[PDB]
Design an enzyme around this catalytic site. Structure first.
Site, PDB file in Angstrom:
ATOM      1  N   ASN A 187      48.897  80.243  32.148  1.00  0.00           N
ATOM      2  CA  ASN A 187      47.451  80.364  32.290  1.00  0.00           C
ATOM      3  C   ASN A 187      46.957  81.603  31.532  1.00  0.00           C
ATOM      4  OD1 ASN A 187      48.961  81.514  34.811  1.00  0.00           O
ATOM      5  ND2 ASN A 187      46.971  82.551  34.964  1.00  0.00           N
TER       6      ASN A 187
ATOM      7  N   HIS B 234      37.258  68.366  26.831  1.00  0.00           N
ATOM      8  CA  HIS B 234      37.730  69.120  25.677  1.00  0.00           C
ATOM      9  C   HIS B 234      37.347  68.429  24.372  1.00  0.00           C
TER      10      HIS B 234
ATOM     11  N   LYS C 228      46.647  71.450  36.688  1.00  0.00           N
ATOM     12  CA  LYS C 228      47.786  72.162  36.120  1.00  0.00           C
ATOM     13  C   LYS C 228      48.132  73.405  36.925  1.00  0.00           C
ATOM     14  CE  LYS C 228      46.058  73.013  32.022  1.00  0.00           C
ATOM     15  NZ  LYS C 228      44.806  72.265  31.934  1.00  0.00           N
TER      16      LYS C 228
HETATM   17  N1  LIG Z   1      45.405  65.684  40.189  1.00  0.00           N
HETATM   18  C1  LIG Z   1      44.159  66.073  39.899  1.00  0.00           C
HETATM   19  N2  LIG Z   1      43.312  65.329  39.154  1.00  0.00           N
HETATM   20  C2  LIG Z   1      42.057  65.749  38.871  1.00  0.00           C
HETATM   21  N3  LIG Z   1      41.567  66.927  39.303  1.00  0.00           N
HETATM   22  C3  LIG Z   1      42.330  67.753  40.050  1.00  0.00           C
HETATM   23  C4  LIG Z   1      43.700  67.360  40.391  1.00  0.00           C
HETATM   24  N4  LIG Z   1      44.242  68.335  41.120  1.00  0.00           N
HETATM   25  C5  LIG Z   1      43.305  69.291  41.250  1.00  0.00           C
HETATM   26  N5  LIG Z   1      42.172  68.941  40.603  1.00  0.00           N
HETATM   27  C6  LIG Z   1      40.943  69.719  40.530  1.00  0.00           C
HETATM   28  O1  LIG Z   1      40.798  70.174  39.200  1.00  0.00           O
HETATM   29  C7  LIG Z   1      40.311  71.536  39.200  1.00  0.00           C
HETATM   30  C8  LIG Z   1      41.354  72.406  38.543  1.00  0.00           C
HETATM   31  O2  LIG Z   1      42.529  72.539  39.338  1.00  0.00           O
HETATM   32  P1  LIG Z   1      43.685  73.548  38.890  1.00  0.00           P
HETATM   33  O3  LIG Z   1      43.939  73.223  37.418  1.00  0.00           O
HETATM   34  O4  LIG Z   1      44.781  73.234  39.877  1.00  0.00           O
HETATM   35  O5  LIG Z   1      43.003  74.903  38.993  1.00  0.00           O
HETATM   36  C9  LIG Z   1      39.978  71.858  40.657  1.00  0.00           C
HETATM   37  O6  LIG Z   1      38.639  71.455  40.949  1.00  0.00           O
HETATM   38  C10 LIG Z   1      40.946  70.964  41.413  1.00  0.00           C
HETATM   39  O7  LIG Z   1      40.579  70.659  42.736  1.00  0.00           O
END
Ligand SMILES: Nc1ncnc2c1ncn2[C@@H]1O[C@H](COP(=O)(O)O)[C@@H](O)[C@H]1O
Ligand SMILES: [Ca+2]
Ligand SMILES: [Ca+2]
Ligand SMILES: [Ca+2]
Ligand SMILES: [Ca+2]
Ligand SMILES: [Ca+2]
Ligand SMILES: [Ca+2]
Ligand SMILES: [Mg+2]
Length: 439
Positions: A138, A183, A115
């Protein structure tokens, strides 16, 4: 909306609850606030005139309220809130208050993981078009702080918890990026209850951006005329690999070679696709949205390349605090030599079984540490080593790396057994990678 003369009660004294206090004070309403913590952080930011109750909820304040504004950190299923609802008292959250006042289009982004990256990237696409965009939602930037008549576009990261208390969102474009079994304390009836909360984001959305690879992101009644998809192998927005190269592809046309981008990893490329789809649907010019893909650096600790030297890529994915995040890092992972994978910390009782299917192949070594290191090594013991700390694990693997290898910190666990937070863990990884692999 008009709140003059109402008895307003806010639950939560974190930054979200504080943003709600400010919202009402700015409108000449003095709310009451409560928090179950005895000494919440936001207590010493409150004005004198705001009555407050800490160390528990004050049920009589809730039952006397005209409006209860509930932090996302308390469950609607909590008995005090169930009693207020049973009595007919209106319960909303900060995002509901925001949507009643927002005077610019809203791009709304939820999902288990990604997100923050997608929200930030849509924000950068808007900035490249010269739009005065407000990006937030956030915990560090609550949506209400963004409200401004000068804002031309809002881009919001929304949690499943916030969506549960929101009824007035009418997004110009909305996405559920993915849904993974996380969650679950808040969702005792399992994955479809967690999903149900997120599905609320599509209600009255003009365009739904859905994940072609995750059926739980489809609207509740299935795909419809509003839906635009992103995915790895196919969809309106997808990835094309050939001759060793990868392109973003939109409606059958390559639009960008990923070598022009600064992000790494298949899941960041699908994040880029989701962002582009949302930007397109919001009416942002395509050319400046692609320009933003070439300048966006990514967020710290999100599959972040902190060192590339001697053919070894050292990747800080410390924000991967859960199995779904690490699974997405390993899926489609491109490594010419050996993957040296760092797993460890406080795993919160997760099922790590899903990770097992990526850990075969003769080019994988596991380095497992922290509270739950032994459980992570048991995924595939013959290629696993276990240490107490991350630094110890990195000192084990550093003499072994060769050009073509990847060193990936994607721990699948929280950091709090050994670090102050995941940022400290990723920062320490970056320091040690430079110490051990920089020369
Ligand atoms: N499309 C995705 N699916 C699953 N995990 C992700 C995705 N994009 C980013 N992440 C990972 O999820 C975590 C949260 O990412 P963020 O919410 O962008 O801070 C980090 O470890 C990211 O690298
Ligand atoms: Ca709060
Ligand atoms: Ca509370
Ligand atoms: Ca445990
Ligand atoms: Ca050992
Ligand atoms: Ca050990
Ligand atoms: Ca953590
Ligand atoms: Mg599939």
């Amino acid at each position: 909306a008009d709140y003059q003369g109402k008895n307003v009660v806010i639950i939560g004294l974190g930054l979200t609850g504080l943003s709600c206090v400010d919202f009402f004070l700015a409108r000449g309403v003095t709310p009451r606030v409560m928090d179950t913590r005895m000494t919440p952080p936001g207590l010493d930011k409150l004005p004198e005139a705001v009555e407050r109750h800490t160390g528990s909820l004050n049920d009589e304040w809730l039952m006397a309220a005209d409006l209860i504004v509930a932090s996302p950190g308390i469950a609607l299923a909590h008995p005090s809130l169930s009693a207020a609802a049973d009595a007919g008292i209106e319960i909303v959250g900060d995002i509901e208050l925001f949507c009643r006042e927002a005077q610019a289009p809203i791009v709304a982004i939820t999902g288990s993981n990604g997100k923050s990256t997608v929200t930030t990237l849509v924000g950068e696409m808007a900035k490249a078009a010269g739009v005065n965009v407000g990006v937030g939602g956030n915990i560090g930037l609550p949506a209400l702080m963004l409200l401004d008549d000068e804002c031309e576009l809002y881009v919001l990261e929304l949690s499943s918890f916030q969506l549960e208390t929101t009824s007035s969102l009418q997004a110009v474009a909305a996405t559920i990026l993915n849904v993974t079994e996380d969650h679950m304390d808040r969702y005792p009836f399992g994955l479809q209850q967690y999903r149900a909360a997120k599905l609320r984001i599509y209600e009255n959305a003009k365009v739904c951006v859905v994940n072609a690879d995750d059926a739980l992101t489809m609207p509740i009644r299935g795909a419809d005329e509003r839906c635009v998809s992103f995915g790895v192998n196919m969809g309106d927005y997808h990835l094309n690999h050939q001759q060793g190269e990868t392109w973003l592809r939109v409606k059958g046309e390559k639009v960008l070679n990923v070598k022009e981008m600064k992000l790494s990893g298949q899941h960041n490329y699908t994040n880029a696709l989701a962002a582009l789809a949302l930007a397109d649907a919001a009416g942002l010019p395509r050319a400046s949205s692609l320009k933003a893909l070439t300048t966006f650096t990514g967020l710290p600790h999100r599959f972040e390349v902190v060192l590339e030297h001697n053919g070894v890529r050292w990747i800080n994915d410390s924000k991967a605090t859960n199995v779904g995040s690490t699974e997405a890092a390993l899926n489609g992972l491109h490594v010419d030599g050996t993957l040296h994978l760092l797993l460890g910390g406080d795993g919160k009782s997760a099922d790590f079984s899903p990770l097992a299917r990526y850990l075969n192949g003769d080019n994988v070594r596991l380095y497992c540490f922290g509270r739950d290191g032994a459980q992570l090594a048991a995924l595939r013991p013959e290629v696993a080593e276990q240490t107490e700390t991350m630094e110890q694990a990195m000192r084990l693997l550093a003499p072994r790396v060769q050009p073509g290898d990847m060193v990936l910190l994607s721990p699948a666990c929280a950091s709090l057994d050994q670090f102050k937070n995941f940022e400290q863990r990723g920062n320490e990884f970056a320091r040690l990678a430079k110490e051990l692999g920089g020369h």
